[PDB]
CSV table of C-alpha atoms and ligand atoms in Angstrom, one decimal:
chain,number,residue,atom,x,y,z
A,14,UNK,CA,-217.7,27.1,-17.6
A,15,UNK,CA,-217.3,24.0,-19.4
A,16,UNK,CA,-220.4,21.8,-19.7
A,17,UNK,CA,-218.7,19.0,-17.3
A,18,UNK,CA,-218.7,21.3,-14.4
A,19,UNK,CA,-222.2,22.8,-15.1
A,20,UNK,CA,-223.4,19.1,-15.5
A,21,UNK,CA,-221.5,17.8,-12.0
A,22,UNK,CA,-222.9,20.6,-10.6
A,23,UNK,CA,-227.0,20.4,-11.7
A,24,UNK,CA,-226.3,16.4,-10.2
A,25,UNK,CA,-225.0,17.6,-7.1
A,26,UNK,CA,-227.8,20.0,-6.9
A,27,UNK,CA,-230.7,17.3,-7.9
A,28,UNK,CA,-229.1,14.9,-4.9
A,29,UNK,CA,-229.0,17.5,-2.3
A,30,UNK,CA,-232.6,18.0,-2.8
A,31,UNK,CA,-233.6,15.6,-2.4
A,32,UNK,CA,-232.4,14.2,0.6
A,33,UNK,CA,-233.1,18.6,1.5
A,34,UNK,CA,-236.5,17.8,1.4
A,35,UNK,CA,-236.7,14.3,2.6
A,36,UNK,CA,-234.3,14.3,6.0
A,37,UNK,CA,-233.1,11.5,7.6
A,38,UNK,CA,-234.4,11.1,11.3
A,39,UNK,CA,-233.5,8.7,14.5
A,40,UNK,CA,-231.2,6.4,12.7
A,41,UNK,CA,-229.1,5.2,15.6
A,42,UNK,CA,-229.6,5.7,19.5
A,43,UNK,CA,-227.1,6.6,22.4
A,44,UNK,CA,-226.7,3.2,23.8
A,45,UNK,CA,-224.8,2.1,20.1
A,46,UNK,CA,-221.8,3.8,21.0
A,47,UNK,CA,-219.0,3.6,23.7
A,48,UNK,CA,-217.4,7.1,24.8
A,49,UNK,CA,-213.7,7.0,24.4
A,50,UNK,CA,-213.3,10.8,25.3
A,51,UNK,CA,-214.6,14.7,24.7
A,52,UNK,CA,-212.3,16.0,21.8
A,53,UNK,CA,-214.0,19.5,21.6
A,54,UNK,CA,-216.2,21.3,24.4
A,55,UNK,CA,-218.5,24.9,24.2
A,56,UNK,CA,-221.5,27.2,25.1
A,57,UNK,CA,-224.0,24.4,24.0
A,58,UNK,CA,-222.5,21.1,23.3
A,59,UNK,CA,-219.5,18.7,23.0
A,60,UNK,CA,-217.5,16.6,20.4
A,61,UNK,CA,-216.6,13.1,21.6
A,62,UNK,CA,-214.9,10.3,20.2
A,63,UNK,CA,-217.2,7.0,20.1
A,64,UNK,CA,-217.1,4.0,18.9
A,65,UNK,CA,-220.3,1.9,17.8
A,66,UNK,CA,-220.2,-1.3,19.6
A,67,UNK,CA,-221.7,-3.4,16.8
A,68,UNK,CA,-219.5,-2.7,13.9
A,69,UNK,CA,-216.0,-1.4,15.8
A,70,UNK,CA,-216.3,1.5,13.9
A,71,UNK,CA,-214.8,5.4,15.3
A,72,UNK,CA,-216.9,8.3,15.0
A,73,UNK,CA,-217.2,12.0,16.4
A,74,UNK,CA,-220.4,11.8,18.4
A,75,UNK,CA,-221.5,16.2,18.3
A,76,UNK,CA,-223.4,16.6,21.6
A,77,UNK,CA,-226.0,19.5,21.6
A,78,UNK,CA,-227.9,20.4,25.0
A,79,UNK,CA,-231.4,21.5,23.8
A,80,UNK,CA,-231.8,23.6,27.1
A,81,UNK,CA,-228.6,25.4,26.2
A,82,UNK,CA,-229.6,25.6,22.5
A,83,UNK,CA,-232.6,27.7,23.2
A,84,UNK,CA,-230.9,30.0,26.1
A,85,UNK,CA,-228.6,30.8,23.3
A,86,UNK,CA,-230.7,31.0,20.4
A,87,UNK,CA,-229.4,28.7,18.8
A,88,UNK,CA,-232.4,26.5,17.6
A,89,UNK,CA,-232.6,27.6,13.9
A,90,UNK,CA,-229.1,27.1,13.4
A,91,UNK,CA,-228.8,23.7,14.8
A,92,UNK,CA,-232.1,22.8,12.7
A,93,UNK,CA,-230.1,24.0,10.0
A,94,UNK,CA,-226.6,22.2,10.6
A,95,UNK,CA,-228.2,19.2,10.6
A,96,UNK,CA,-231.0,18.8,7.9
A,97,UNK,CA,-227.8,20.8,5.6
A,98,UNK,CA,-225.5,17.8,6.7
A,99,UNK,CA,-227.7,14.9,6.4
A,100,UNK,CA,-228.4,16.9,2.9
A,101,UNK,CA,-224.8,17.4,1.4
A,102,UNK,CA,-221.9,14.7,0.2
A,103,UNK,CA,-218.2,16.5,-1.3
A,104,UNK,CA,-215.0,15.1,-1.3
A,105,UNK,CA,-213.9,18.1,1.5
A,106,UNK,CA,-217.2,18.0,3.8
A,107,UNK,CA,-216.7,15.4,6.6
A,108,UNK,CA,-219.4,12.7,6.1
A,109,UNK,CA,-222.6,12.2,8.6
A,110,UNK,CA,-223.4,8.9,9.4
A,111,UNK,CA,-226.4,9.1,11.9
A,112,UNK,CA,-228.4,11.6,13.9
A,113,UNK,CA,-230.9,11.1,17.1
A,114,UNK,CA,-231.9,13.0,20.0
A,115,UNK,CA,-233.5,12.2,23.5
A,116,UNK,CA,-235.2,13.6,26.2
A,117,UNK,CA,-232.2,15.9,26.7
A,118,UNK,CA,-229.5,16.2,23.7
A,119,UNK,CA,-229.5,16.4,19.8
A,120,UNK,CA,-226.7,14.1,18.4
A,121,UNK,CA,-225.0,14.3,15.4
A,122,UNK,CA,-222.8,11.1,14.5
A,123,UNK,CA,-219.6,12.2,11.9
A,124,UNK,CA,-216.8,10.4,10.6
A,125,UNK,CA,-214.2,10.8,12.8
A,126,UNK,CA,-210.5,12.0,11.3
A,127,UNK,CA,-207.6,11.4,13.5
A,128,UNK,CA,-205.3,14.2,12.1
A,129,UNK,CA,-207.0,16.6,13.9
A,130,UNK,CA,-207.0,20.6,13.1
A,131,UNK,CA,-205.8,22.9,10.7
A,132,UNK,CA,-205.1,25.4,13.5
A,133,UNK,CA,-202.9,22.6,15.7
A,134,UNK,CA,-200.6,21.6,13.0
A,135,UNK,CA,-200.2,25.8,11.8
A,136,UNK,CA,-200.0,26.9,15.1
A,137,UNK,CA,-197.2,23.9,15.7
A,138,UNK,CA,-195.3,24.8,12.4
A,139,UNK,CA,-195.7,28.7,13.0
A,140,UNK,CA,-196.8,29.1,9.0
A,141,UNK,CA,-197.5,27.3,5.9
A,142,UNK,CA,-195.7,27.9,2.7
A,143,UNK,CA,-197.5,29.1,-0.2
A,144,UNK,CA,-197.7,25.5,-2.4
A,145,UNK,CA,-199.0,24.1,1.2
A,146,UNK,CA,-201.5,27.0,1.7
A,147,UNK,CA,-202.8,26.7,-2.3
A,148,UNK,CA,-203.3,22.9,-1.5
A,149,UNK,CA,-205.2,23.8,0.8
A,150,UNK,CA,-207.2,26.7,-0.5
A,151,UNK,CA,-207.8,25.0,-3.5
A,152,UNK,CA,-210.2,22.6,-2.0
A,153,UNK,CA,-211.6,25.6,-0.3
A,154,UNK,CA,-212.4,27.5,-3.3
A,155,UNK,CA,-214.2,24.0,-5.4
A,156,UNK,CA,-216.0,23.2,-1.3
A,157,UNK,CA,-217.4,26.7,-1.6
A,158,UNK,CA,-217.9,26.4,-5.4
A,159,UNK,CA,-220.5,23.6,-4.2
A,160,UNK,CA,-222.0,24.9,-1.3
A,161,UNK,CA,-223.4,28.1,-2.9
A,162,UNK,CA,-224.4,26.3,-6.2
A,163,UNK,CA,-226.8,24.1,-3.7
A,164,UNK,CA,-227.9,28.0,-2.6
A,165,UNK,CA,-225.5,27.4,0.6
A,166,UNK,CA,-223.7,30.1,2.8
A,167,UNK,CA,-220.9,28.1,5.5
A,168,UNK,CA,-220.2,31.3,7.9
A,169,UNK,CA,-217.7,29.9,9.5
A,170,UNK,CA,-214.6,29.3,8.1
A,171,UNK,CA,-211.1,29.3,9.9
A,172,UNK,CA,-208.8,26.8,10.6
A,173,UNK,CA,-210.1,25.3,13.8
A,174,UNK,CA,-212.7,23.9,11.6
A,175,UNK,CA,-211.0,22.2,8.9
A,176,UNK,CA,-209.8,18.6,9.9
A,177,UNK,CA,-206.8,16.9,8.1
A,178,UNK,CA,-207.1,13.1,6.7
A,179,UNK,CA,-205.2,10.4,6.9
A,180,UNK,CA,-204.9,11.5,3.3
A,181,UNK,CA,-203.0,15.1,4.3
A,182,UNK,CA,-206.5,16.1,2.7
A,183,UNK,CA,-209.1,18.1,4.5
A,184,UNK,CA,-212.7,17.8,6.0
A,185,UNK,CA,-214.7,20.5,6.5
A,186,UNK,CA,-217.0,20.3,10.3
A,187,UNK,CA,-219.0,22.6,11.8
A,188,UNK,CA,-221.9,23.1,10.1
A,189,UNK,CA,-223.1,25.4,13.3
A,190,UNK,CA,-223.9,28.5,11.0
A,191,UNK,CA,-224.8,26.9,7.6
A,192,UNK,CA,-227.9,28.1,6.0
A,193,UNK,CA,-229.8,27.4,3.0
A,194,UNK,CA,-229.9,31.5,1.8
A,195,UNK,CA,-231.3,32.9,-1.8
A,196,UNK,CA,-230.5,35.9,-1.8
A,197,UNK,CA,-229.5,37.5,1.7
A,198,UNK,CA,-229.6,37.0,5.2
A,199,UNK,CA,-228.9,38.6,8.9
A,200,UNK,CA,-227.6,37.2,11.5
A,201,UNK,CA,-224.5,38.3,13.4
A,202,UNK,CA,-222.8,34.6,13.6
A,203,UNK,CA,-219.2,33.6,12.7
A,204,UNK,CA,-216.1,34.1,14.6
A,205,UNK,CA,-214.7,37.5,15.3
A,206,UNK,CA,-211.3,38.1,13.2
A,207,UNK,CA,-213.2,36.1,10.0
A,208,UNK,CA,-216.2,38.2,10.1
A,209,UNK,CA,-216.5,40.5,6.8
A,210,UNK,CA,-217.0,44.2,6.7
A,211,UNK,CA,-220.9,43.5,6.1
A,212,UNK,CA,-221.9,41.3,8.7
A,213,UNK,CA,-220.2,43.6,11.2
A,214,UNK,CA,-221.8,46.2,9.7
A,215,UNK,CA,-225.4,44.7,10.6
A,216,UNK,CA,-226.1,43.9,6.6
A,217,UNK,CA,-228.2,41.8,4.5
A,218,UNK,CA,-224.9,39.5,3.3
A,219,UNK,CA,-224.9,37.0,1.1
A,220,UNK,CA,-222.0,34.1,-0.3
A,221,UNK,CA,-219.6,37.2,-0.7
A,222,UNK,CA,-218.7,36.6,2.9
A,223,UNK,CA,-217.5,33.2,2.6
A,224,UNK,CA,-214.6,34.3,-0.2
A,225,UNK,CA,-214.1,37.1,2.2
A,226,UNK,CA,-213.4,34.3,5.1
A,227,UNK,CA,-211.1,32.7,2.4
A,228,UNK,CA,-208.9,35.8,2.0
A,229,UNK,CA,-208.5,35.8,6.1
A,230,UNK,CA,-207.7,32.2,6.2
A,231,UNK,CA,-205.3,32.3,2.9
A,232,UNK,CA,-203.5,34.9,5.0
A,233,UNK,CA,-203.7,33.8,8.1
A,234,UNK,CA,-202.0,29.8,6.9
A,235,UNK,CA,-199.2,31.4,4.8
A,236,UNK,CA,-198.5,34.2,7.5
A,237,UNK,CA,-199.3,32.3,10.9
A,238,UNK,CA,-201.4,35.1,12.4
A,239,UNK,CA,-204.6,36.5,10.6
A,240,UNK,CA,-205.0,39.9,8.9
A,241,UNK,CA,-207.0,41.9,11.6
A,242,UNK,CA,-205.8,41.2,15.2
A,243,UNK,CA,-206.3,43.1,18.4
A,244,UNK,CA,-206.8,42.3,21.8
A,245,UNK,CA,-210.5,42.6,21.6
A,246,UNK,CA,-213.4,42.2,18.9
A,247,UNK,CA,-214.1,46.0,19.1
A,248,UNK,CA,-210.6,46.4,17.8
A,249,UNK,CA,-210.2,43.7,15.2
A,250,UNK,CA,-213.8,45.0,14.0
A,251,UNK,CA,-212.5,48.8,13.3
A,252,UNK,CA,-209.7,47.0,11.5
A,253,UNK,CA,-212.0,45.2,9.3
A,254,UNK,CA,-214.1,47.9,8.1
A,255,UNK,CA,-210.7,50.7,7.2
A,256,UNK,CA,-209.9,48.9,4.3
A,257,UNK,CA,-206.7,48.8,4.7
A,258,UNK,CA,-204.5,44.9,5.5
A,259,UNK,CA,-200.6,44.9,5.6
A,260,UNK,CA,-198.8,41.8,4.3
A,261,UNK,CA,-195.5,40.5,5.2
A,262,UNK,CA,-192.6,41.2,2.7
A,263,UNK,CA,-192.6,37.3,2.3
A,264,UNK,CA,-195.9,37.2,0.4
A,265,UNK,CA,-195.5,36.9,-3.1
A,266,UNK,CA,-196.7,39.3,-5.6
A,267,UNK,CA,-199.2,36.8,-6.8
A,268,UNK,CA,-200.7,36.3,-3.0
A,269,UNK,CA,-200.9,39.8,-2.0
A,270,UNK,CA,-203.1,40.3,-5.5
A,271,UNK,CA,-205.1,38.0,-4.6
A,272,UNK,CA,-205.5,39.0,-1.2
A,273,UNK,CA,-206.7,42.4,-2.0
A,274,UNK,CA,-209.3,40.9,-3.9
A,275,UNK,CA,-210.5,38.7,-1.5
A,276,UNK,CA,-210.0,41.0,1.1
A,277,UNK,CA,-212.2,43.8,-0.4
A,278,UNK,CA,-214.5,45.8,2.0
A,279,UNK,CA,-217.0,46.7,-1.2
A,280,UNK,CA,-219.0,43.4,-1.5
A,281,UNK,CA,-219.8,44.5,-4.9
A,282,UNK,CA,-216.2,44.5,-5.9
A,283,UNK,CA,-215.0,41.0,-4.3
A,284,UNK,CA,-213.5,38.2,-5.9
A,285,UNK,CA,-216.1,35.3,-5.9
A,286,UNK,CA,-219.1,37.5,-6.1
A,287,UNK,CA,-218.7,39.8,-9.6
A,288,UNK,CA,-220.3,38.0,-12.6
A,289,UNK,CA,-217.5,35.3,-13.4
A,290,UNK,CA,-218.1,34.4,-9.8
A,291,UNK,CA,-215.7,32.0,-8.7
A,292,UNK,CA,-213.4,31.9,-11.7
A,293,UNK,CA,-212.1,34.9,-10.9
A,294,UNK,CA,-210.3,33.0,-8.1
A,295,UNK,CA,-209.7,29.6,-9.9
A,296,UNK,CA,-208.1,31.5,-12.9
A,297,UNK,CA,-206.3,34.1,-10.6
A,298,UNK,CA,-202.1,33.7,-11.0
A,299,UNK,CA,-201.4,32.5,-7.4
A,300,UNK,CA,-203.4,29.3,-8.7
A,301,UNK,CA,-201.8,28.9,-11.8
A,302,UNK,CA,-199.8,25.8,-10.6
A,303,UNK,CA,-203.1,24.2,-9.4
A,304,UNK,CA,-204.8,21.2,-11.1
A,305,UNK,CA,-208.3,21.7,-10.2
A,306,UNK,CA,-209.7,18.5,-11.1
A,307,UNK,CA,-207.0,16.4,-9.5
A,308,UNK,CA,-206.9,18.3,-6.4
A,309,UNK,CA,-211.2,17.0,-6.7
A,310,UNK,CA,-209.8,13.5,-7.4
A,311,UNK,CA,-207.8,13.8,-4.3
A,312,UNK,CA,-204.7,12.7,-6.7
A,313,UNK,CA,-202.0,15.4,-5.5
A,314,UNK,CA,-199.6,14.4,-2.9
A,315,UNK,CA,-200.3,16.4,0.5
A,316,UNK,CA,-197.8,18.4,2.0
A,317,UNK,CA,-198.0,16.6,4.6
A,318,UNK,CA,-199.8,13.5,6.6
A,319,UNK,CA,-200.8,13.7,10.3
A,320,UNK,CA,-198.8,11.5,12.3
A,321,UNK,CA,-201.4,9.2,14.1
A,322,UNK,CA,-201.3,5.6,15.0
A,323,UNK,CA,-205.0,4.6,13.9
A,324,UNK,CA,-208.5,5.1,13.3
A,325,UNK,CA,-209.3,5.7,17.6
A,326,UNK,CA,-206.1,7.7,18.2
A,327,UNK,CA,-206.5,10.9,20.0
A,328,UNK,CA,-202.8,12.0,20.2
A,329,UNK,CA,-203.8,15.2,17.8
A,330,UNK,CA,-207.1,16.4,19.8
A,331,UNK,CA,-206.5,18.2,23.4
A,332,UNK,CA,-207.6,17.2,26.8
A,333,UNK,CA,-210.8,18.0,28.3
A,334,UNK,CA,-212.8,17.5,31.8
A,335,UNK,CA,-215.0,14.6,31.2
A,336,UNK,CA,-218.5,15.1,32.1
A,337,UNK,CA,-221.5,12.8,31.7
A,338,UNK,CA,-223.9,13.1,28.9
A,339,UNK,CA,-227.2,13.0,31.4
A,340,UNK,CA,-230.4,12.2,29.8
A,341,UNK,CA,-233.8,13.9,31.6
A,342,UNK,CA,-236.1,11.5,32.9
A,343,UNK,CA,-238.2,14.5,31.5
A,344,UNK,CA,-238.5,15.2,27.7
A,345,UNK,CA,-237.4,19.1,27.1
A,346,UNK,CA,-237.7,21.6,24.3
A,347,UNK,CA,-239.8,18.4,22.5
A,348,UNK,CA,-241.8,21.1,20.2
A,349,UNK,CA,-238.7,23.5,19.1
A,350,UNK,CA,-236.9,20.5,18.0
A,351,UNK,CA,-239.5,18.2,16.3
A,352,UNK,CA,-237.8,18.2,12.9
A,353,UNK,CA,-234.7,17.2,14.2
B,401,DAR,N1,-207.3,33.1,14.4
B,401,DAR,C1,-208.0,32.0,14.5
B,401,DAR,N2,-207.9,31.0,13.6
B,401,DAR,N3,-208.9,31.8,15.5
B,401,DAR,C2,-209.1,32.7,16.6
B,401,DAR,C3,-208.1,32.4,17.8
B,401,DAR,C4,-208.4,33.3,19.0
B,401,DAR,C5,-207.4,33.0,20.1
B,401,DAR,N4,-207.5,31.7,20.6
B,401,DAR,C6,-206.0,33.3,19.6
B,401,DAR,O1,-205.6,34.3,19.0
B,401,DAR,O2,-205.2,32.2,19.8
């Protein structure tokens, strides 16, 4: 690698740590921010659009109920979202501005982009063509060249998570299964038809699995549907571990190469993880069009821009019930959250 790159990335690794070892804490409160509505809803917590009534500003306001967090054992992971997010700063990652928590919630302030999901504006266009697909894997493959340089494993990648800016640019969020891993680690987390052969397989994994969940979502944007699909996880599971994909007749030579390699069961023979790591990918022939430091310098036209009227517009987020965000008279779960 040339010494620019290996210079970037020691910087990047010297700045992560040390906000790694030195987190930010309670640097705003709940009673900053107006609600404007829930733009995201699940198991544990919410995703709401505020905005901070000081400075006018928009933000996603990530709601976590700490009572919920330990019933689903969760409290590692959310330790870890947040100390990795307060930690990390990449052209692709969305940005966090502030973090607090009360007698009831953890709260994770982010910048808020308008455009909404990857997996809206596919599912709405049925598939991506391959230059649109590369733009986007491209700052994939240099957002997960950084991540595991800082010794970083993101487990969750798919297009639900991958918001597009009023640039046509994304920003990755969800930093739910994130972890800080040298070497390997355990837990059965990620979403069903993105998971790779090893986790399902109950395996000490390690970054493989990410370029794995790049194959998937490579497929998945340039064909519309993902690579293993069935009607339940047992299914697209058994599909997983055979070894065996089928790619439409569209898919260029190039793509389906690259695929295979992405998409190989035998960790030890996976593009991203063999000893050239992730050049193997960067110098592969589907990216041969692709300018890798102008695609970092955000200076390639998008494919396309979301259509959005301004910095508070919902128009590209669905509709939720809106439920209060109740705060205990009571402090709970104080202890198993103390870092937070
Ligand atoms: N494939 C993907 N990006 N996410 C999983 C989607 C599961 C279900 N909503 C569906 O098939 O619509």
């Amino acid at each position: 690698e040339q010494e620019s790159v290996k210079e970037f990335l020691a910087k990047a690794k010297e700045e992560f740590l040390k906000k790694w070892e030195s987190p930010s804490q309670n640097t705003a409160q709940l009673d900053h921010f107006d609600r404007i509505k829930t733009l995201g809803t699940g198991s544990f917590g919410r995703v709401m659009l505020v905005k901070h009534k000081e400075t006018g500003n928009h933000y996603a306001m990530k709601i976590l109920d700490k009572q919920k967090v330990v019933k689903l054992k969760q409290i590692e992971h959310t330790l870890n979202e947040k100390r990795i997010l307060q930690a990390v700063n990449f052209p692709f990652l969305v940005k966090l501005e502030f973090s607090f928590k009360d007698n009831s919630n953890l709260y994770m302030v982010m910048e808020y982009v308008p455009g909404g999901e990857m997996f809206s504006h596919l599912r709405r266009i049925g598939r991506f063509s391959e230059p649109h697909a590369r733009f986007y894997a491209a700052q994939i493959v240099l957002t997960f060249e950084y991540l595991h340089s800082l010794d970083l494993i993101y487990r969750d990648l798919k297009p639900e998570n991958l918001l597009i800016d009023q640039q046509g640019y994304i920003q990755v969020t969800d930093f739910g299964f994130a972890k800080r891993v040298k070497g390997r680690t355990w837990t059965l987390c990620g979403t069903p038809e993105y998971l790779a052969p090893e986790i399902i397989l109950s395996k000490g994994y390690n970054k493989a699995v990410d370029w794995w969940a790049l194959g998937v979502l490579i497929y998945e944007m340039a064909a519309g549907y993902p690579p293993f699909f069935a009607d339940q996880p047992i299914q697209i599971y058994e599909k997983i571990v055979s070894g065996k994909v089928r790619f439409p007749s569209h898919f260029s030579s190039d793509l389906k190469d690259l695929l295979r390699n992405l998409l190989q069961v035998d960790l030890t023979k996976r593009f991203g993880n063999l000893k050239n790591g992730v050049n193997d990918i960067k110098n592969h022939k589907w990216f041969a069009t692709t300018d890798w430091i102008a695609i970092y310098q955000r200076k390639v036209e998008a494919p396309f821009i979301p259509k959005f009227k301004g910095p508070g517009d919902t128009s590209n987020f669905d509709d939720y019930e809106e439920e209060e965000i109740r705060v205990s008279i009571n402090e709970k779960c104080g202890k198993e959250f103390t870092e937070f």
